[PDB]
């Protein structure tokens, strides 16, 4: 009765420590006839002969559990891989002791690998625990390493799924490149200042240099990294006040080997309690079959609970990782690594030392430096947003109304419609009218500046499917909203169901419905049954990728018109007005007050009598944001007085 | 180039046809030194595998490696992935354990399999579910590794469709089931289609628990990936007759066609990379005592013999060969669904019950119903190409379309029915609570006794090929003689149209 | 976890919440209506009262029924007894606004206008009908 245990080990002193741990494992574990034998191998510079030596030693040895504890002296990459693959061929368990790569967490590669150390991805758990201490909710994730950092990003999005509060922006790039300053500018432009990095040494030193070039060590900035960033040459160029994580006894090798041998020993003494016990044979002689109680012994190792340990209480999770590991939380007090906190698995306790921040005093960084400037996008709506080219040099002609009130114009930026069809300049331009003056009143109410720009292409924005993999995307003003290019859509935006699922809406400032523009012979709205089956004499359509398209796509009895007007959709409303003025159409489907304004302009343009889809123009907004309550309250304050009536007296009520 | 093709098999297949596999091929021979070496093997232990790989690398500096397998040992492909991570040898697996799916690779690794990823197989399964309009479903997974990416890709794919997949909860497990609290997770399932992601050792117990809890009706459906569908011979009794699986094992493309495609990929990469730089093959000297232009970033633009055998960034195939199989009442696997560049091609647009899981199923609610096109009653239209789905007021149907007169063979092209009688059928299915298989007639018009032979819907109902004709149909004396009618619902006599 | 017994207060108006007696011959509301109760004080001397069960129909009742058939929640509907919609009197709200603020009513399904002070003290849904102010003459 013997049990063979293999060990892949570095030194010669820890070989004696492994033999001493085998001797101590046979001390108090009963007078049973079982014994424990020790087998140790050393390094080779190339990994092929490492796997060759391991298989030639351990096929002849018939071991049960293999301990692998490679310290990376020449290279920090994938040295415990071959022993893991070799024993995972025969499904023999490998206990990794010094490696921490998250590629070992995926058991689709390593079928029979466990480890008594926690990987870097569970550091993200601590980073989630960094959010509950200071009540932080918006973070900026910068992942450098694409090898294992996607697993840490997935773990962070999994742990933030319980709060249902996503990160503000996640960024991924390639290790090795240096010029990553545009990523830093994208991290700059957002209101949050919490920066979370997981990287190797060299890319961390690169982004430390590039952040020192860009004032990112000042006040408000919060830097939160792991173990690989507080060492090497990255520690030489680390910004002061940084918060890092460190493994308590993570390189203490002797006690770690002893605790692993105790784990293996109690697993063996539990394995002898059961029957149907086999041995992994000499696999080099024609043995392609796996060891039959492989998953059984693996299930023993996964559910192996322990209360003994020199480092502490060791326990495996559902993925074979070290649970409830104590961490040190380190601060960099002017190029001095200072321990400022301890991490049990459920809670953080700081010590008597104070957490000196990267900025000025010891006050906590409320990392929401909210912007007084808001990116505003709108479309050229003729009764609402007049867009007109500048007079002399980027300036607007000061035009007066009928009462001598100066028209409050703004310097927006207007690109042309066809960028390859003509030399496209993207010149600034003048914006005024209804919604522009509403925005000027809103900026008059609350102290915030603004930058009005326009949409790249004249579409509101629809749920449009992209060609590869049939994936849904958004375009137009909503496509520029969700891409971060916009912050607040003040525009004639139609409220419906599909938009409010993704973005938020204020209370509507305009109440109107859909109606029909004709040339005057009665039509009498949508309830004319002859338009239900149209022909070449009923030529009518709507704006391409408008809200009318979605509203007619939902209602199934309006499908036939939806299968007609899809052949004649136009890019903008004014093109349809000019087409129906020359009698190239017969009707048009659009909102109420715009067509009433066009009827006030041109007497031949006639709106119909019926009315449907009584909805409201409101302000298109972002997600959870501090511009939800007071914007709606300011619109409602504009509704309770006669200011909306005065804006109607400017353009809506105004006849000609 | 210097290319070795190894076959670790059990069924004895000779090797000189692999030597002839290059001879009449490569009509435009751009490389100047191409020699293939075919080897056979019966033992797949990694010591001997690495030994033979080092012997072949010392064997006149072999630069390309092809490995086939007939067994289920998937770790051999991982050992080949480790070998390619060190010796810088492009290695292509074929079948068996040589092409079973592993998740992520290394940039030093140039090993690439012949198989489809679990994400593309999830796209396959959701395409199958889209083509039958089985919208409401459930997802049941376990703690087998590779489940978080599976559930994540399903959650992204539901959020990237116009279908509106009314999905139930995602049910996982914890341990070997006590049948106490996992049973509570299983009792909440009441929808039809269940996607099951678990290993073959677990799937027998899970389907036995589902059969013991009445989750194996013909209303229900069970679709599994290739994780449980391994050996075609090994079929336990607990598999439900009506199981739909997907695997890339094709009986039309054997191992010889696969190694021919692998040699085509290797010769295409060698002849196309030679046009940029000449001295591309630079093998490692020996395996004892330790590059700019590699084929790791050149494998994307490959096309040999018309086959689009392009590769992905994760190491998979862009257009891989998938096979959609079912489990019939004969307890065997039948090849059903084949594949286009992107979409599915079904051999049977008619999906029958596959009712007999065993003899313990006495129920009956499906009704074979034929109709006929009438312009105010039954409007039959093409399916919407934007969604590949009949719009919600319409119902799916088939039409046995024949392109041309002399050929009797036709295709059951799926179309969408709407109108008045379709609304009547939907409200009857709401009230009486039954199902149906609505289809069209190709014999002709409503009904006429052509020499003691009825045509159209009357010929369907009298000869019992259709259960009832819910579609629009006039009633007169002889029609009331041969079949039976219901109460009338619309005052339809005759009339005369004039100016 | 039982967080769906939603207590809902409503207000008597003619075009929206038609509040009728139950049928005395059948003791059952007709099935196109909903049940409700009203806390009517019988004696004027003290604060005793009874919850008389009555029937409700109309426009907002159909909105409540379609919400109950779409979102699939239970609802416990009752009339307000303190008076009209509500007004801040001595910094004390009353009406449906008071029943939502003092947490006896979860939501106000009945007909209710929107101004700044209500949007301060409670939160409205989206508007479903264009109802401003208006002037009736002959
Ligand atoms: C117990 O382990 C020892 C040490 O690994 C084994 O002794 C080795 O046996 C091999 C047999 O080929 C010899 O080549 C070595 O010289 C021995 N060890 C040394 C000095 O390196 C021993 O065989 C094992 N006994 C068993 C079977 O339990
Ligand atoms: C951490 O490193 C220290 C270095 O001293 C080690 O701890 C001692 O190890 C020796 C040899 O095993 C023991 O006799 C002592 O009991 C340990 N220190 C104490 C508690 O006095 C060890 O390698 C690592 N782990 C520990 C136990 O801290
Ligand atoms: C680490 O472990 C200690 C126990 O040793 C945890 O202390 C418990 O914490 C919870 C929540 O704060 C309390 O309700 C219990 O009363 C505590 N029990 C004891 C015995 O202390 C501690 O929370 C963990 N994390 C740290 C370091 O705070
Ligand atoms: C929205 O407007 C309200 C108006 O009351 C603002 O609330 C006040 O602002 C201060 C700012 O420090 C807050 O402390 C208080 O909640 C309010 N005043 C007091 C003393 O009651 C609110 O800040 C505005 N929110 C934004 C910025 O949109
Ligand atoms: C490369 O380096 C410069 C250095 O300032 C950096 O600003 C920029 O992002 C990169 N390219 C340029 C010159 O735009
Ligand atoms: C950093 O801050 C200063 C503030 O005066 C300003 O010149 C600029 O934003 C940055 N200049 C550098 C690169 O030091
Ligand atoms: C354990 O071994 C006995 C004797 O070889 C065998 O009969 C039995 O099948 C095994 N255990 C199981 C699987 O019940
Ligand atoms: C962490 O440290 C505390 C204090 O020494 C100890 O009680 C606890 O058991 C440790 N946990 C582990 C698993 O190291
Ligand atoms: C945008 O529009 C005009 C007219 O289409 C075009 O000539 C020019 O490229 C742009 N603006 C200027 C500079 O006129
Ligand atoms: C404008 O901002 C300043 C600085 O934060 C603040 O003092 C003031 O109250 C704000 N409001 C006005 C009056 O515009
Ligand atoms: C996808 O196809 C559409 C046409 O349906 C085309 O406009 C678009 O350019 C294609 N690709 C992109 C960039 O989405
Ligand atoms: C396995 O293959 C080798 C090489 O072909 C051969 O020498 C050996 O005899 C085979 N083993 C058996 C038992 O067939
Ligand atoms: C691949 O090469 C061919 C050469 O004709 C050509 O289709 C094109 O240049 C390339 N296409 C891709 C996908 O790079
Ligand atoms: C793939 O598409 C091409 C046309 O681009 C077509 O010729 C070919 O037949 C398609 N392949 C399949 C499998 O249908
Ligand atoms: C039927 O006729 C058309 C036109 O001649 C022809 O293109 C088609 O191939 C024929 N179909 C067959 C062969 O059944
Ligand atoms: C044969 O079928 C074609 C349609 O595919 C049709 O145009 C033609 O009239 C048919 N021939 C006859 C006379 O049956
Ligand atoms: C109200 O009070 C009167 C006596 O004053 C009594 O008769 C009556 O029953 C009371 N109302 C009730 C309790 O219904
Ligand atoms: C108050 O007094 C009157 C007297 O008839 C009677 O209706 C009842 O007692 C009370 N009515 C009210 C207001 O409930």
UniProtKB/Swiss-Prot annotation, chain A:
It comes from the Eukaryota. Glycans are attached at residues 37, 179, 215, 252, 276, 326, 344, 416, 447, 467, 533, 630. Keywords: Calcium, Cell membrane, Disulfide bond, Glycoprotein, Ion channel, Ion transport, Ligand-gated ion channel, Magnesium, Membrane, Metal-binding, Phosphoprotein, Postsynaptic cell membrane, Receptor, Signal, Synapse, Transmembrane, Transmembrane helix, Transport, Zinc. GO terms for molecular function: amyloid-beta binding; calcium channel activity; calcium ion binding; calmodulin binding; enzyme binding; glutamate binding; glutamate receptor binding; glutamate-gated calcium ion channel activity. Disulfide bonds join 55-284, 396-430, 412-431. Residues 1-520, 521-656 are extracellular. NMDA is probably regulated by C-terminal phosphorylation of an isoform of NR1 by PKC. Its phosphorylated state is influenced by the formation of the NMDAR-PPP2CB complex and the NMDAR channel activity. Its main location: membrane. NMDA glutamate receptor activity is potentiated by Zn2(+) in a dose-dependent fashion. The potentiating effect of Zn2(+) is at submicromolar concentrations and its inhibitory action is at high micromolar to millimolar concentrations. Excitatory glycine receptors are inhibited by D-serine at 100uM. Glycine binds at residues 492, 494, 499, 547, 591. One of its GO terms (cellular component) is glutamatergic synapse. Detected throughout the brain, in brain cortex, cerebellum, thalamus and olfactory bulb. A hydrophobic region that gives rise to the prediction of a transmembrane span does not cross the membrane, but is part of a discontinuously helical region that dips into the membrane and is probably part of the pore and of the selectivity filter. Heterotetramer; the NMDAR subunits are modular and harbor tiered domains that function in concert to regulate opening and closing of the cation-selective ion channel pore. Forms heterotetrameric channels composed of two GluN1/zeta subunits (GRIN1), and two identical GluN2/epsilon subunits (GRIN2A, GRIN2B, GRIN2C or GRIN2D) or GluN3 subunits (GRIN3A or GRIN3B) (in vitro). Can also form heterotetrameric channels that contain at least two GluN1 subunits and at least two different GluN2 subunits (or a combination of one GluN2 and one GluN3 subunits) (in vitro). Belongs to the glutamate-gated ion channel (TC 1.A.10.1) family. NR1/GRIN1 subfamily. This is Glutamate receptor ionotropic, NMDA 1. It comes from Rattus norvegicus (Rat). The lineage of its organism: Eukaryota, Metazoa, Chordata, Craniata, Vertebrata.
Swiss-Prot record, chain C:
It comes from Rattus norvegicus. This is Glutamate receptor ionotropic, NMDA 2A. It is found in: Cell projection, Dendritic spine; Cell membrane; Synapse; Postsynaptic cell membrane. L-glutamate binds at residues 111, 113, 118. Glycans are attached at residues 43-44. Component of N-methyl-D-aspartate (NMDA) receptors (NMDARs) that function as heterotetrameric, ligand-gated cation channels with high calcium permeability and voltage-dependent block by Mg(2+). NMDARs participate in synaptic plasticity for learning and memory formation by contributing to the slow phase of excitatory postsynaptic current, long-term synaptic potentiation, and learning. Heterotetramer. Forms heterotetrameric channels composed of two GluN1/zeta subunits (GRIN1), and two identical GluN2/epsilon subunits (GRIN2A, GRIN2B, GRIN2C or GRIN2D) or GluN3 subunits (GRIN3A or GRIN3B) (in vitro). Can also form heterotetrameric channels that contain at least two GluN1 subunits and at least two different GluN2 subunits (or a combination of one GluN2 and one GluN3 subunits) (in vitro). In vivo, the subunit composition may depend on the expression levels of the different subunits. Found in a complex with GRIN1, GRIN3A and PPP2CB. Found in a complex with GRIN1 and GRIN3B. Contains an N-terminal domain, a ligand-binding domain and a transmembrane domain. Agonist binding to the extracellular ligand-binding domains triggers channel gating. Belongs to the glutamate-gated ion channel (TC 1.A.10.1) family. NR2A/GRIN2A subfamily. Disulfide bonds join 29-55, 36-56. Detected in brain cortex, olfactory bulb, hippocampus including the dentate gyrus, striatum, thalamus, superior colliculus, inferior colliculus, midbrain and cerebellum (at protein level). Detected in brain cortex, hypothalamus and cerebellum.
